[PDB]
Amino acid sequence: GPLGSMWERLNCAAEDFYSRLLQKFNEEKKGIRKDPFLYEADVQVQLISKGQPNPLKNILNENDIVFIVEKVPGPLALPVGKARQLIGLYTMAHNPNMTHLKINLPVTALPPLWVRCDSSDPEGTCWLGAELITTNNSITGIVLYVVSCKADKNYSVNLENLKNLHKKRHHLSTVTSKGFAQYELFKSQTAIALDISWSPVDEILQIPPLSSTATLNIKHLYRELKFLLVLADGLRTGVTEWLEPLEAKSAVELVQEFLNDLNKL
Amino acid sequence: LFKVRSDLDFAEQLWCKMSSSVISYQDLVKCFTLIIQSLQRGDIQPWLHSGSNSLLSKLIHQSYHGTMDTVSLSGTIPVQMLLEIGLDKLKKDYISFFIGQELASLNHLEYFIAPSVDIQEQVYRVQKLHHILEILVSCMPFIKSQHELLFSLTQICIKYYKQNPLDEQHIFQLPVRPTAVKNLYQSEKPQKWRVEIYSGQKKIKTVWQLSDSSPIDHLNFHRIFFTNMVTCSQVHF
């Protein structure tokens, strides 16, 4: 649209994004418009509320309300560069230092925004996220998340390296840890896994201790019920898909025979 | 071995018989014709479990205490009739499972049991009850002899299905004590292992995770381990 051009600020790209997104947060706090809105014909945006499947649960302990942004049709990923623009709009739309031309009320913190990326980027980014930091009602900052994902025959990681890596990167002296493990109990609805989390972590691949917090995650029918539905559908459409009978005696014989028995006292 | 409901009344035995044999509309007309005539002739005195709003039960009460309506088994009435008999009998099967196992009270189930709603809605609600049993059956091997786990699961399922349609993708979460589930994980290799490092600022984090399959559904990859990381940047305004 005006995005990427001189008319971007002029024609309010960010503000129109922030407004669109504010519709849904305000909308879904009631109506659940089972349609991910087309922001840019090729780009769609869903909100994730309630207890619906959250794609971020695969990689994060938090199960918050969240927008997911993706390429219009598994789900498809936008190029990293494009995702970064969208993360940009969302950031600016909430920035107090940014001149506003349409919006004339204080901006509300919106649900975090997350965007599916295709890697194809030196550092192989598969997700970009943005989350607001609010002091009271007043905003203040955003957290910008990068997610990368590698598949290999090997892997190397060190609990100390990650501890420091976090310390160096965010200038901190202490640091704590939270652990999570998932166990697939049953596959094939029909999928059951056990989620376990504890604090603190003292070992990579540590076996969750028994003081961990835990949950069970749960994601030819018999003939009588099947017959029930057959009757129900027939009644609805006028086309009854009768089942093969189980009995050699016909319906009438079985019934007459039933009746005979009840007359004999 | 769960206890089968065998105390079946006339209407219920009828349902069982007809449900294994009926292969056409005319089957229904002929079967119901024989029963109605058997009733008008007064040749039988059948017993019914109390509290059924089926046309057949009505027509039976009228046969015992008085005399019956001229039914006319035309249009969709013979279908309707068998459908009613099936619904009662199946609702009573489910009630007896859930009450009997102490997974729910009659009160809890009222929504699924409802007489007032239309016949397709009643059927649809029987399917919800069934889908609840399927969930339970799926978990039984894992929450073996944990009646409270079985109980809560049944409760959260009931809560969900009063408010929601059958077709939605949904993850049920059942809090479980690690002891109650020890054997299922302690010697097991996890499908994912995740460490998250943060400090007071709980939003600010570094996350490392190992998985035995892709934790990213859109990732196109064109024994393998999957590794992924989550890092962030603070930006102040």
Looking up tokens 């049920």 gives B172
| Contacts with A231 from chain B: Cβ below 8 Å | 79, 82-83, 86
DSSP state string for chain B: -PPP-----HHHHHHHHHHTT--SHHHHHHHHHHHHHHHHTT-------S----HHHHHHHHHHSS--------TTHHHHHHHHHHHHHHHHHHHHHHHHTTS--HHHHHHHH-SSS-HHHHHHHHHHHHHHHHHHHHHTTTSTT-HHHHHHHHHHHHHHHHHS-TT----EEEE--GGGGGGGTTTSPPSEEEEEEEESEEEEEEEEEEESS-S-TT------EEEEEEEEEEEE-
Q: Is the peptide bond before A200 cis (omega within 30 degrees of 0)?
A: yes
Minimal Cα–Cα distance from B224 to chain A, Å?
Answer: 5
What tokens were used for A64?
């918050």
Let me know how long chain A is.
265
Measure Cα distances from B81 to B22, B49, B88, B94 in Å.
13, 17, 11, 20
Where residue B183 falls (left for φ over 0; alpha for ψ -120 to 50; beta otherwise) is alpha
* Same domain for B177 and B161: no
Measure Cα distances from A178 to A62, A81, A145, A167, B76 in Å.
12, 32, 18, 16, 62
Where do the H-state alpha helices sit in A47-148?
A: 80-94
Are B171 and B161 within 8 A, CB to CB? no
Taking the C-alpha atoms of residue B138 and residue B146, their distance in angstroms, rounded to an integer, is 14
Which CATH number belongs to the domain containing residue A175 in this structure? 2.20.25.230
3-state SS record for B186-228: CCCCCCEEEEEEEECEEEEEEEEEEECCCCCCCCCCCCCEEEE
Measure Cα distances from B135 to A53, A188, A224, B7, B169 in Å.
17, 14, 19, 26, 13
CB contact under 8 A, A252 and B34: yes
Query: CB neighbours of B51 closer than 8 A, spacing ≥ 6?
Result: none
Measure Cα distances from B163 to B111, B154, B168 in Å.
10, 15, 12
Let me know how long chain B is.
237
* Same domain for B57 and B17: yes
Give me the resolution in angstroms, 1 decimal: 2.5
Q: Which amino acid is at A123?
A: E
Q: Which amino acid is at A157?
A: V
Instruction: Flag whether residue A233 sits within 8 Å of chain B, measured between CB atoms.
Output: no
What tokens were used for B72?
């006319």
Q: Which amino acid is at B215?
A: P
Q: How many domains does chain B have?
A: 3
Which CATH number belongs to the domain containing residue B53 in this structure? 1.10.287.1880
* Same domain for A147 and A41: yes
> Among the three residues A151, A186, A205, which one is the final residue of a domain in this structure?
A151
* Same domain for A163 and A200: yes
> Among the three residues B16, B43, B71, which one is the final residue of a domain in this structure?
B71
Q: Residue B236: inside a domain, yes or no?
A: no
* Same domain for B160 and B79: yes
* Same domain for B132 and B85: yes
Q: Residue B237: inside a domain, yes or no?
A: no
* Same domain for B193 and B123: no
Angle at B42 between CA B37 and CA B48, to 5 degrees: 90
For residue A110, the tally of other CB atoms under 10 A from its CB is 22
Query: CB neighbours of B26 closer than 8 A, spacing ≥ 6?
Result: none
Instruction: Flag whether residue A260 sits within 8 Å of chain B, measured between CB atoms.
Output: no
Which structural domain, as residue segments, surrounds residue B180?
172-231
**What is the DSSP pairing of strand A192-198 with strand B225-236?**
unpaired
Where residue A192 falls (left for φ over 0; alpha for ψ -120 to 50; beta otherwise) is beta
* Same domain for A75 and A31: yes
* Same domain for A171 and A200: yes
Q: Residue B3: inside a domain, yes or no?
A: no
Taking the C-alpha atoms of residue A259 and residue A252, their distance in angstroms, rounded to an integer, is 10
Looking up tokens 């091997």 gives B141
Most A CBs within 10 A among B80, B81, B163, B194, hence the mutation to make, goes to B194
* Same domain for B216 and B182: yes
Are A151 and A176 within 8 A, CB to CB? no
Q: Which amino acid is at B150?
A: L
> Among the three residues B31, B53, B71, which one is the final residue of a domain in this structure?
B71
First-to-final CA distance of chain B: 65
Measure Cα distances from B129 to A247, B122, B148, B162 in Å.
28, 11, 19, 10
* Same domain for A233 and A109: no
What is the DSSP secondary structure assignment for residue A247, as one 8-state letter?
A: -
Angle at B213 between CA B209 and CA B218, to 5 degrees: 90
What tokens were used for A70?
């993706």
Measure Cα distances from B47 to B10, B31, B221 in Å.
6, 18, 66
> Among the three residues A182, A200, A219, which one is the final residue of a domain in this structure?
A219
Torsion of CA A84, A89, A93, A99, to 10 degrees: 120
Helix B147-163 with B119-139: angle, nearest 10 deg: 150
* Same domain for A121 and A190: no
Angle at B209 between CA B203 and CA B213, to 5 degrees: 130
Are B46 and B62 within 8 A, CB to CB? no
* Same domain for A145 and A78: yes
| Portion 64-93 of A in contact with B at CB < 8 A | 70, 74-77, 91
Of B58, B118, B51, B136, residue with least CA distance to B89: B51
Q: Which of A174, A212, A255 sits opposite B34 (nearest CB)?
A: A255
* Same domain for A203 and A157: yes
* Same domain for B93 and B30: no
**What is the DSSP pairing of strand A213-218 with strand A192-198?**
antiparallel
What tokens were used for A180?
């999570």
First-to-final CA distance of chain A: 86
Minimal Cα–Cα distance from B44 to chain A, Å?
Answer: 6
* Same domain for B98 and B155: yes
Are A237 and B79 within 8 A, CB to CB? no
List the single residue in B with minimal CA-CA distance to A177. B197
CB contact under 8 A, B236 and A140: yes
Query: CB neighbours of B127 closer than 8 A, spacing ≥ 6?
Result: A225, A229, B166
Minimal Cα–Cα distance from B94 to chain A, Å?
Answer: 12
DSSP, collapsed to helix, strand or coil, labels residue A90 as helix
What tokens were used for A219?
């994601």
* Same domain for B163 and B149: yes
Taking the C-alpha atoms of residue A85 and residue A73, their distance in angstroms, rounded to an integer, is 20
Instruction: Flag whether residue A230 sits within 8 Å of chain B, measured between CB atoms.
Output: no
In terms of Cβ atoms closer than 10 Å to its own Cβ (0-12, 13-18, 19+), residue A125 is buried
Q: Residue B150: inside a domain, yes or no?
A: yes
CB contact under 8 A, A60 and B230: yes
* Same domain for B154 and B86: yes
Of A57, A43, A226, residue with least CA distance to B170: A57
CB contact under 8 A, B127 and A255: no
* Same domain for B86 and B125: yes
* Same domain for A170 and A119: no
* Same domain for B145 and B99: yes
Where residue A41 falls (left for φ over 0; alpha for ψ -120 to 50; beta otherwise) is left
> Among the three residues A182, A197, A219, which one is the final residue of a domain in this structure?
A219
Q: Residue B2: inside a domain, yes or no?
A: no
Which structural domain, as residue segments, surrounds residue A242?
220-265
* Same domain for A144 and A156: no
